Design an enzyme around this catalytic site. Structure first.
Site, PDB file in Angstrom:
ATOM      1  N   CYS A  89      28.679  20.604  52.602  1.00 44.79           N
ATOM      2  CA  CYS A  89      28.748  22.068  52.607  1.00 44.79           C
ATOM      3  C   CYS A  89      30.081  22.476  51.987  1.00 44.79           C
ATOM      4  O   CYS A  89      31.130  22.383  52.631  1.00 44.79           O
ATOM      5  CB  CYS A  89      28.619  22.631  54.017  1.00 44.79           C
ATOM      6  SG  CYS A  89      27.016  22.419  54.792  1.00 44.79           S
ATOM      7  N   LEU A  90      30.040  22.935  50.740  1.00 41.99           N
ATOM      8  CA  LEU A  90      31.224  23.404  50.033  1.00 41.99           C
ATOM      9  C   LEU A  90      30.937  24.762  49.415  1.00 41.99           C
ATOM     10  O   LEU A  90      29.880  24.960  48.804  1.00 41.99           O
ATOM     11  CB  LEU A  90      31.645  22.410  48.946  1.00 41.99           C
ATOM     12  CG  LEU A  90      32.939  22.727  48.200  1.00 41.99           C
ATOM     13  CD1 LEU A  90      34.093  22.924  49.180  1.00 41.99           C
ATOM     14  CD2 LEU A  90      33.251  21.617  47.226  1.00 41.99           C
TER      15      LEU A  90
END
Length: 153
Positions: A89-90
């Site tokens: 998750c970026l």
């Protein structure tokens, strides 16, 4: 190779990484597929991930650099924003993607993510819980995967 705009752009990313790699990062296209890269990120100094050598794969579409690639840790990871399967998750891979970002900036953003987890995306509930309630035990877990990152099973 050089047949599409995405592939030429990827070759240029590869050139930048060869001749001017940011500290603690490396990556190259796979031998038979320019759309799939292998990368290694060194854990940032001063963090629990220091000395860690983490392999990742990166898969690009022909829409690169307009569409961000999908990035997955290959090495075992213990981090609030990284799922058990390695998915990450970026923000710049989900909401804040810019066609100005290349492989180098993607690897450094993840490197920075290791230092400063995003509390809005608890992909690893235990890693998120320990990070916000027990830094010592969190770092104990990170130390374990740092040492395991030296072995590529």
């Amino acid at each position: 190779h050089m047949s599409t705009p995405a592939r030429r752009r990827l070759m240029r990313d590869f050139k930048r990484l060869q001749e001017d790699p940011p500290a603690g990062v490396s990556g190259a296209p796979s031998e038979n597929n320019i759309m799939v890269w292998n990368a290694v990120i060194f854990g940032p100094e001063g963090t629990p991930f220091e000395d860690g050598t983490f392999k990742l794969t990166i898969e690009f579409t022909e829409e690169y650099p307009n569409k961000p690639p999908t990035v997955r840790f290959v090495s075992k990871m213990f981090h609030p924003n990284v799922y058990a399967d390695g998915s990450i998750c970026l923000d710049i891979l989900e909401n804040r993607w810019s066609p100005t970002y290349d492989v180098s900036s993607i690897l450094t953003s993840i490197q920075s993510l290791l230092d400063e987890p995003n509390p809005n995306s608890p992909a690893n509930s235990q890693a998120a819980q320990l990070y916000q309630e027990n830094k010592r035990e969190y770092e104990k877990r990170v130390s374990a995967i740092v040492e395991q990152s030296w072995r590529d099973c």
